[PDB]
Amino acid sequence: MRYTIMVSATASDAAPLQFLAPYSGCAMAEYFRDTGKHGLIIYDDLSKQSVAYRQMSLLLRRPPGREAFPGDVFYLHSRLLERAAKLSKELGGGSLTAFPVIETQAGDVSAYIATNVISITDGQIFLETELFYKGIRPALN
Amino acid sequence: MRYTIMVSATASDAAPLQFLAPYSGCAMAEYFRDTGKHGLIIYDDLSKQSVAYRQMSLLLRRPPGREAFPGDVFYLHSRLLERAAKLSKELGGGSLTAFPVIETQAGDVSAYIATNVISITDGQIFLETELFYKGIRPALN
Amino acid sequence: DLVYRTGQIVNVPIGPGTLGRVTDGLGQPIDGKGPLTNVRSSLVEVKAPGIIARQSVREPLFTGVKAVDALVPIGRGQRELIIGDRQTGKTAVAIDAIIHQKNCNEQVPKAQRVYCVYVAVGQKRSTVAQLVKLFTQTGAMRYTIMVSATASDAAPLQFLAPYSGCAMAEYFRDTGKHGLIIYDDLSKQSVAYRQMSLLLRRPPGREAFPGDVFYLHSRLLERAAKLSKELGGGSLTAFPVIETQAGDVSAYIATNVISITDGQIFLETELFYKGIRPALNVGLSVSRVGSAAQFPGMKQVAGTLKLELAQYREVAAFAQFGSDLDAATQYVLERGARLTEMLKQKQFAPIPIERQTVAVYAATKGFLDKVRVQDIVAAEEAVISQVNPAVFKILKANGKITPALDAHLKAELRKVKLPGA
Amino acid sequence: DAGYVSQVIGPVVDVRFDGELPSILSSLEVEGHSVRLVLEVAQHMGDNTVRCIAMDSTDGLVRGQKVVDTGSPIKVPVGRGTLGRIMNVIGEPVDEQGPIDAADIWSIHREAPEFTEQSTEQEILVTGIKVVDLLAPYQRGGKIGLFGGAGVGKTVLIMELINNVAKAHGGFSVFAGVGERTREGNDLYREMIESGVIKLGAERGNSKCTLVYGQMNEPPGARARVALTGLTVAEYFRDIEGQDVLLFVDNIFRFTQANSEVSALLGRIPSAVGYQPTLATDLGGLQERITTTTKGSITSVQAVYVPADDLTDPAPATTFAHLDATTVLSRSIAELGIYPAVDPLDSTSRMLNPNVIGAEHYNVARGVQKVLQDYKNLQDIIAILGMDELSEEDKLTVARARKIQRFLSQPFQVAEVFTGTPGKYVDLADTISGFQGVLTGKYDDLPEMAFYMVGDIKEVKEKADKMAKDIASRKEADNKKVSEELKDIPSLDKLVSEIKEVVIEEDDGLEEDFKAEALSSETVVLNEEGKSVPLPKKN
Amino acid sequence: ALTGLTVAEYFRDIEGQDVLLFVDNIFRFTQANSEVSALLGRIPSAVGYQPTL
Amino acid sequence: ALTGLTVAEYFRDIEGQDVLLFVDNIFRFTQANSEVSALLGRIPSAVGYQPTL
Amino acid sequence: EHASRMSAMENSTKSAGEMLGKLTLDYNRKRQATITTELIEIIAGASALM
Numbered sequence A, B: 001m002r003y004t005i006m007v008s009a010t011a012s013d014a015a016p017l018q019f020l021a022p023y024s025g026c027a028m029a030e031y032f033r034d035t036g037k038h039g040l041i042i043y044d045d046l047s048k049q050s051v052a053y054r055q056m057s058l059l060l061r062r063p064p065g066r067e068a069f070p071g072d073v074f075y076l077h078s079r080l081l082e083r084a085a086k087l088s089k090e091l092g093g094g095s096l097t098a099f100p101v102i103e104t105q106a107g108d109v110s111a112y113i114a115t116n117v118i119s120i121t122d123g124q125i126f127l128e129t130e131l132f133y134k135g136i137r138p139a140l141n
Numbered sequence C: 001d002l003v004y005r006t007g008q009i010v011n012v013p014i015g016p017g018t019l020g021r022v023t024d025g026l027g028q029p030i031d032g033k034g035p036l037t038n039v040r041s042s043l044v045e046v047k048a049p050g051i052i053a054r055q056s057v058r059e060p061l062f063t064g065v066k067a068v069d070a071l072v073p074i075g076r077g078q079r080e081l082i083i084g085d086r087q088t089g090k091t092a093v094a095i096d097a098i099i100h101q102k103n104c105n106e107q108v109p110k111a112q113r114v115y116c117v118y119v120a121v122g123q124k125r126s127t128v129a130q131l132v133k134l135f136t137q138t139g140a141m142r143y144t145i146m147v148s149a150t151a152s153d154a155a156p157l158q159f160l161a162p163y164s165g166c167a168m169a170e171y172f173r174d175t176g177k178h179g180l181i182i183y184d185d186l187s188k189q190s191v192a193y194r195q196m197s198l199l200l201r202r203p204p205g206r207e208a209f210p211g212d213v214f215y216l217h218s219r220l221l222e223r224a225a226k227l228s229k230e231l232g233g234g235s236l237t238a239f240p241v242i243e244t245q246a247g248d249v250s251a252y253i254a255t256n257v258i259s260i261t262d263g264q265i266f267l268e269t270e271l272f273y274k275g276i277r278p279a280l281n282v283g284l285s286v287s288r289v290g291s292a293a294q295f296p297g298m299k300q301v302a303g304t305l306k307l308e309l310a311q312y313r314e315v316a317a318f319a320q321f322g323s324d325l326d327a328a329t330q331y332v333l334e335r336g337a338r339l340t341e342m343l344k345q346k347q348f349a350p351i352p353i354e355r356q357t358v359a360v361y362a363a364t365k366g367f368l369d370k371v372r373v374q375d376i377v378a379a380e381e382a383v384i385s386q387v388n389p390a391v392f393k394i395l396k397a398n399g400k401i402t403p404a405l406d407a408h409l410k411a412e413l414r415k416v417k418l419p420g421a
Numbered sequence D: 001d002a003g004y005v006s007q008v009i010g011p012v013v014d015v016r017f018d019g020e021l022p023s024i025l026s027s028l029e030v031e032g033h034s035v036r037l038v039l040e041v042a043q044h045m046g047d048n049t050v051r052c053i054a055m056d057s058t059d060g061l062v063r064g065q066k067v068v069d070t071g072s073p074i075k076v077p078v079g080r081g082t083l084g085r086i087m088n089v090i091g092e093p094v095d096e097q098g099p100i101d102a103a104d105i106w107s108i109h110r111e112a113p114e115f116t117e118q119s120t121e122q123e124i125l126v127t128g129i130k131v132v133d134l135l136a137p138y139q140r141g142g143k144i145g146l147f148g149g150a151g152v153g154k155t156v157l158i159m160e161l162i163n164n165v166a167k168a169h170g171g172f173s174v175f176a177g178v179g180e181r182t183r184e185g186n187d188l189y190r191e192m193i194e195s196g197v198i199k200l201g202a203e204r205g206n207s208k209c210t211l212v213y214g215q216m217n218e219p220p221g222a223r224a225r226v227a228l229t230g231l232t233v234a235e236y237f238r239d240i241e242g243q244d245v246l247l248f249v250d251n252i253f254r255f256t257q258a259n260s261e262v263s264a265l266l267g268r269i270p271s272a273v274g275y276q277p278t279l280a281t282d283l284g285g286l287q288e289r290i291t292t293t294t295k296g297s298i299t300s301v302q303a304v305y306v307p308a309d310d311l312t313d314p315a316p317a318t319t320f321a322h323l324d325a326t327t328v329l330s331r332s333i334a335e336l337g338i339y340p341a342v343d344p345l346d347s348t349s350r351m352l353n354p355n356v357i358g359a360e361h362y363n364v365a366r367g368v369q370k371v372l373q374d375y376k377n378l379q380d381i382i383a384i385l386g387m388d389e390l391s392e393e394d395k396l397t398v399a400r401a402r403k404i405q406r407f408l409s410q411p412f413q414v415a416e417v418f419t420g421t422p423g424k425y426v427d428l429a430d431t432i433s434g435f436q437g438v439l440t441g442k443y444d445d446l447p448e449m450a451f452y453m454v455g456d457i458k459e460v461k462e463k464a465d466k467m468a469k470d471i472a473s474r475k476e477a478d479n480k481k482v483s484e485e486l487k488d489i490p491s492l493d494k495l496v497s498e499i500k501e502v503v504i505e506e507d508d509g510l511e512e513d514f515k516a517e518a519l520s521s522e523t524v525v526l527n528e529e530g531k532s533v534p535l536p537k538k539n
Numbered sequence E, F: 001a002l003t004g005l006t007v008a009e010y011f012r013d014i015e016g017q018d019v020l021l022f023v024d025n026i027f028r029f030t031q032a033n034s035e036v037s038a039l040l041g042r043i044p045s046a047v048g049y050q051p052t053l
Numbered sequence G: 001e002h003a004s005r006m007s008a009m010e011n012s013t014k015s016a017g018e019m020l021g022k023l024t025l026d027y028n029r030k031r032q033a034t035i036t037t038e039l040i041e042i043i044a045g046a047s048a049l050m
């Protein structure tokens, strides 16, 4: 915690606060990206940001799409995860590394929000539930 | 029909009358429960009351839910079926036992009205149509 | 801006001056050959002819596709749906129907000719220019109208092009001649009608379609009628094309047009990649006019073909065990497979109907039992190219395989050499 | 007094009445329309406006066009004067035999009779079909439904019912073609001229059938009320003339569908699968009128389209409860080639009580359903392994049930034009005995394809010896001089000279009669006087 | 369920105890909040639950 | 996707030569119009897309 | 042969239990997607009128 910021929007917080905390956390980590230093960010459960954002869209009476998600739920995570960059030498050389976390349901990586972030992020660390109950931990697929 | 009442809201009757016929028959049946006698009530096609209540709700511009049923269609059947009780001995000790009849579609008891009435009642009598033609009549699964 | 009313419900030029031309969905020609000359402006939404105005569908309409002139026969005046998935042969079956009419219009009198209308809704201009290049190279353009509301056109133009194309094709029906309209992607017309209706704020229904998307398609398709002899006796034959998604014919527009049309030519994407081309699913394909409007002679041999393919389908899902010989199922497991590879056909080459019924005669009577299953498409060439070509001349004129012919052509299929020994 | 059109959205018109609105269900006549356009008031909108459904098309309606109230609902001709005629939804003749004689002019809108005038008398209707008369017998006086998807044979089965039941019937018949193809309404008409059911011209009173047609081309206002028009013709024969009527309704699914095509434009938020919120009540109010009262009898046969073979769809599933005998037709049975494709374990009748048809008919019906459900339970193995692991206990119940499936198949008189086999009418006493025999074992040695497409149990033995004759025909019929070139046929070089060479004109005869019209290249619009001027260069 | 919490929250915050709160069928708490969102006209989320699930 | 097309259309129409247009995810043209049309006051089509897809 | 048939049907009951396990998960996705699709079409039709 000497080097860590903790941006918490829990389950009791309002849905616009859970929608905003990935962006609030990314602005705090973009301070280190822009001043030549290096940053790590973990948005634990971007699955839960999109559900908080789906709540704001359906309460704004906006027309829903796949799994009642708004049409801009791709742009929700796309706008956020593009800010994790490695800057050039003329911009300082700083960097921000993102680790978005997505919880699937029954191994379904072909869900809507899951496949949205697979097409945003560079890599993928797929953690398997059959390897996890066999004691193989970290249960890397 | 020395002991039977027949409350009949048929198909050409108005949809408020088919909605109101289970409640009208239960008030006739609650006379025996409240006077220390015992009643027995059969709501044949409780899945046809709910379609009649859906018709009045969508025409009164009430907000639809799943399968376009109103939000209070659980409250419709629960406030009808909880009137079937076994009263204590200080209230005469009378009773009323209900038999709602739900018609499923190809056995799908995960449909919306069938799910609601399964939650309310104290058990089902299933009647499969494969057991019906297998000679098992009554086809009680 | 100012909006002037024209006093006119929507019109298109119908007449004999439209034959050979490529027009858009409103009648303006897009082929760059000038205005339409020998035409008059008729309405676009015409009421369909009633019960008294019609007569029974008796004369056939030969497609040239062997799987449909035999199994799913089509009469002059019926509506045959071509339903299937994407890239399964729907346009190719319909194009072969148009090309074949050129091969048959030169051999019939003036009252027997069929004038085709191809309505291309929601396709590219690259695809339509490929068709006009094809219909000019064959020679089918002198009988064909091409009504083309492509994908860059407005959704009201793609909505109206089936009706505007039918009104052009109804000229030939109403004047005693015979028409053939092909509505390619009637699925893409309903998408254009859905768009045009959601923007007019008409409330959506199933798959956001309007409520009257059945009446969109029934009032179009019921205009394909075989008229009575008091009304000239003309006919219009519709071939609507509906595209399904992963074979799901339970979708909203597919179930509407299946229930409107008489027959259906169902094409599958798994039969297409087994080499069965045209990929006709013989079980699901129906024609509700039926063998009432079949070529006789073809009708004599199709009963042996429809029955043996019915047994060949139930013997399948037991055919994975060639160790398990039975020699009664194995008899029909190969006999139906002679028939299955009999019905294969290369595209843009329709066959005359008399050459088809001889090739079905050569496999229902067992002449091609000696050849292997893998070389029947070459054997059907050996049947056709080695018999006397006067067997086809008297079968077309007599109209049925006469008793003075089924013993002529019995020994004629014995003096041919079949590629199997 | 009169009203004027204020709004036209598709087939739905709002009409504004400055004082004295018409009642709901009232008929309005639009004055000045080219065809006779009739609107029926659906609802009162609220500001002296009614909302209507049009019985014909609305292209050509102008806002402000005068609309005359008739003070009554749609009124159709009823009586003997309509027999042998074809009527419209609005009672107009479309058969071109002149105007229709009117015993009375009845409204098409009515209430269902009452609970007190209901006839609780179940008596059998001998159809002549083996699978119908055995497993789901029809009631004389009751409501019959033929459920099936597209292309399983409901129109053929209702054509077989018309010439097996209504041909030998004392009362009259009404065929209400509700939203099907116009071609098969012309097929049904010409079938009944040549069969003598409809007699044209001066023998018109000797006709025994009234046709009401509301076919697929017509707008959803017409297809929703044409079942009510065809019912009114049958309700006049039942009430005023007091006789046994037959009402064949082709595709009662189209009544619910045509209400669904307008109901979103009537201001109703949608229900489930695409249907109106008033689905069971529109359908209920029609079907409660097709009843046998104490005055007369209406034996109704209703084809029901089942969308995409899905009996769980709410338009077939609501009309199950309105019927006495449901004849579910299956696509699975038709893929075997068995016709009529009646599903034996999905067709149900109220007549299958042993109190009504007797226990001797009841046990051969329940026994056939028992042996066919067992075969369905055994196809989990014998379509995977191959009928070798059953030890001849229930190998025999397969070959009993496989002969039963073909014995339920039957040739039709109306399917002679389709298939080359004659029609077979089976008596009820014959189909009990023929199906008791395969059930018990009186016919255990005949092959299974001798039962296919036969009349009765004398026709399976007349087919079995025909099969074992013509097996032996395939050993000498080929040579040794019976199919020679010289015996009974001419030569091939001569036959091409025999045939008359038809004359090909290669000029196709198109423009020799065509009266053209000059196309204006420039757009012709209307100015404020209404004069067709060029479109102005003001942009 | 909020009433059962508030009785249980007194034993935690004032009495200072370890409380057992038995919520019999938490699914019925979900579906009753799903009904009150449908009655307030809110557009439901995926499979039919309230947007604030 | 219209800006990059216009650059490719100039080399085709004016320069008159064969060009290659690689468009990575032309779906994101369709998806972007579907985000805008929710706010342009439109009844949504099938799965949630714009009526003018 | 009976021991090989005992082992060929412990691999087949296993493989038809893993196939059924992947079919009930995919049906439950299509079950949930069907209710969301039916609901969105009912809300889009109610919002067009209200």
Ligand SMILES: Nc1ncnc2c1ncn2[C@@H]1O[C@H](COP(=O)(O)OP(=O)(O)OP(=O)(O)O)[C@@H](O)[C@H]1O
Binding pocket: C085, C086, C087, C088, C089, C090, C091, C092, C093, C243, C277, C278, C345, C346, C347
């Ligand atoms: N009988 C056939 N033999 C060989 N190839 C065929 C045959 N019929 C069609 N094809 C080819 O298969 C492909 C299928 O395209 P086709 O013209 O059938 O369009 P479609 O699949 O009906 O329509 P869409 O392009 O919308 O998917 C084409 O390449 C066509 O040339």
Ligand SMILES: Nc1ncnc2c1ncn2[C@@H]1O[C@H](COP(=O)(O)OP(=O)(O)O)[C@@H](O)[C@H]1O
Binding pocket: C286, C287, C288, C289, C290, D148, D149, D150, D151, D152, D153, D154, D155, D156, D157, D339, D340, D412, D415, D418, D419
């Ligand atoms: N009894 C029968 N015998 C032979 N073929 C039949 C029979 N009934 C139906 N068919 C076939 O099925 C098709 C269905 O015809 P139809 O009854 O018009 O369909 P639908 O029931 O969908 O209206 C017919 O064209 C015919 O080819």
Ligand SMILES: [Mg+2]
Binding pocket: C090, C091, C184
């Ligand atoms: Mg195509």
Ligand SMILES: [Mg+2]
Binding pocket: D154, D155, D180
């Ligand atoms: Mg029909």
